[PDB]
Design a protein around this ligand. Structure first.
Ligand SMILES: O=c1ccn([C@@H]2O[C@H](COP(=O)(O)OP(=O)(O)O[C@H]3O[C@H](CO)[C@@H](O)[C@H](O)[C@H]3F)[C@@H](O)[C@H]2O)c(=O)[nH]1
Ligand SMILES: [Mn+2]
Length: 537
């Protein structure tokens, strides 16, 4: 329990009269100690109120003899949130949420989702999709491909020089991409208010037919096939549900889905709303169930192979003998000594049903305060999440996303609403953005400055700071330190063991996940550019 008001009076006793701010602290502490109710949120809020009062006294009387005790009390307050969070716990709602928006869900994604379904029959699979937006990927592809060709043609004389800086190509291509997105968006805005009430896909189809030499029948078949494939495999339509219950979040989802064509960012929004409204477990479609602990207890690992590769090899080894996922890679497993191999086959074949290989989720016991998250490379990663419906931390993350977008859009909207090309739009945005800089927000500003080229140029990673892991990391800071609207600071994986997605319940090092991580750094960028040059000729 926290120290009592009487104990604090004894500990902080001084020759000096009690300051008014000290009396307030004593009252807040006593009120926390006397709380009759068992509602976690109420306890947390009263903690917060007390912590805030202590800071007011410490800032005001910096040399006070009471500060040592009050400093200790703050440390005890930090421990209590953990205790509070860990004291009343119970199973999360039995929902597995997946999201696939913007096109046909792939067969490979369905296979991965199938593993989860087989192992966890009591959970109700929810594959969220947007019934009006099956052609967004098709459009983004068309725009990028056409732009790549335009940039190569413009730069044809230079691209052969082996010393050519491929960043001249990516910047020029971005100018063409921006012009093409802007043509689409202005066309969309001219259609969307018509009395025919067209859908996103109606408008994309028309635009592709008129400007990208496409065939309406082929696009319509692709769209209807996507709608049928998804509905047959646990699909649930965002347009027909209660995820979006305010305009602000919908506008954020729409700006990513329609203006940027950033499907991952749109999915970042949907997953939060799905957890807020329904609770359960959110998984990217490249995640796989966790391997039973004992399964490979009996297999020391060669020190030549890495801690992560060892996990990839365990998955590859399981597939090589059960074929649960068709054509699953065997590359890192084939290179092993036969006793290793023969040992793997031996333990593997020992088992009878898949539930002996992968672990069930069963009850995932969590606090209504928290959200649990996977880790990667020292950071949180929002590819796997656990949250009760309406959890306090899930709401903190949503608030972080809203505040970040409100700030982004304050500076971005005047620029994009201009009739200006990419270069001049970027200048208007940046001039506004960086005139707002402070010591607290400067890193954030620098990270969101390349927002418009996210997905199209190497090193544009603004999504992490808007809808992705950075927002979760700052919300964790908020929660742990009883703060709100943290922008400068993030908590790291080493800070968040109490919030880790339980290691035994998840396999992150799948073939599909490793396929996704191939990011847009300078190394990937050089390779894609070389292939573009290779194909152009
Ligand atoms: O065409 C598409 C492409 C992707 N999505 C959604 O985005 C999710 C993640 O995509 P993906 O794994 O390819 O990118 P990744 O770099 O790993 O995402 C991280 O960064 C992402 C953004 O912060 C984050 O969403 C993700 O969890 C991180 F791991 C995927 O499981 C879908 O829900 C889609 O619906 N349609
Ligand atoms: Mn991934």
């Amino acid at each position: 329990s926290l120290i009592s008001k009487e104990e604090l009076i004894k500990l902080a006793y001084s020759i000096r009269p009690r300051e008014n701010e000290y009396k307030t602290i004593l009252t807040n502490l006593d009120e926390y100690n006397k709380l009759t109710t068992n509602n976690n949120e109420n306890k947390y809020l009263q903690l917060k109120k007390l912590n805030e009062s202590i800071d007011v006294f410490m800032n005001k009387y910096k040399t006070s003899s009471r500060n040592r005790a009050l400093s200790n009390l703050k440390k005890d307050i930090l421990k209590e949130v953990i205790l509070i969070k860990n004291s009343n716990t119970s199973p999360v709602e039995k929902n597995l949420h997946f999201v696939w928006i913007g096109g046909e869900v792939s067969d490979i994604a369905l296979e991965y989702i199938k593993q989860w379904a087989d192992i966890n029959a009591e959970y109700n699979i929810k594959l969220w999709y947007d019934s009006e937006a099956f052609l967004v990927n098709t459009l983004k592809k068309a725009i990028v491909e056409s732009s790549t060709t335009e940039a190569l043609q413009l730069l044809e004389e230079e691209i052969q020089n082996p010393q050519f800086d491929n960043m001249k190509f990516y910047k020029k291509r971005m100018e063409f991409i921006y012009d093409r997105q802007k043509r689409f968006i202005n066309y969309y805005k001219s259609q969307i208010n018509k009395p025919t009430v067209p859908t996103i896909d109606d408008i994309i189809k028309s635009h592709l037919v008129s400007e990208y030499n496409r065939d309406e029948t082929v696009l319509e078949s692709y769209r209807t096939n996507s709608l049928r494939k998804i509905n047959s495999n646990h699909g649930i339509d965002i347009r027909a549900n209660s995820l979006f219950t305010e305009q602000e979040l919908l506008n954020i989802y729409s700006q990513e889905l329609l203006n940027r064509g950033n499907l991952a960012a749109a999915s970042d929004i949907v997953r939060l709303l799905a957890l807020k409204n329904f609770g359960g477990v959110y998984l990217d479609v490249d995640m796989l169930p966790g391997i039973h602990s004992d399964l490979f207890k009996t297999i020391s690992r060669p020190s030549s192979i890495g801690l992560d590769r060892w996990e990839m090899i365990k998955l590859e080894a399981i597939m090589k003998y059960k074929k649960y996922i068709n054509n699953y890679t065997s590359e890192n497993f084939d290179k092993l000594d036969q006793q290793l191999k023969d040992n793997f086959k031996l333990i593997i074949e020992s088992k009878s049903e898949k539930s002996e290989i992968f672990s069930k989720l069963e009850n995932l016991n969590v606090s209504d305060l928290e959200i649990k998250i996977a880790f990667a490379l020292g950071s949180v990663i929002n590819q796997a999440l656990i949250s009760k419906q309406g959890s306090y931390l899930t709401n903190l993350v949503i608030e972080q996303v809203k505040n970040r977008y409100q700030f982004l859009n304050q500076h971005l909207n005047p620029a994009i609403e201009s009739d200006n090309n990419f270069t001049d739009t970027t200048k208007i945005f940046h001039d506004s953005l960086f005139n707002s800089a402070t010591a607290e927000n400067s890193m954030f500003l620098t990270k969101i400055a390349p927002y418009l080229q996210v997905g199209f140029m190497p090193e544009a990673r603004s999504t992490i700071s808007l809808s992705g892991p950075g927002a979760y990391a700052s919300a964790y800071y908020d929660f742990i330190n009883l703060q709100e609207n943290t922008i400068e600071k993030t908590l790291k994986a080493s800070d968040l063991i109490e919030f880790k997605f339980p290691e035994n319940n998840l396999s992150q090092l799948t073939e599909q996940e490793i396929n996704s991580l191939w990011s847009f750094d300078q190394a990937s960028a050089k390779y894609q550019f070389e292939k573009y040059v290779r194909d152009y000729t």
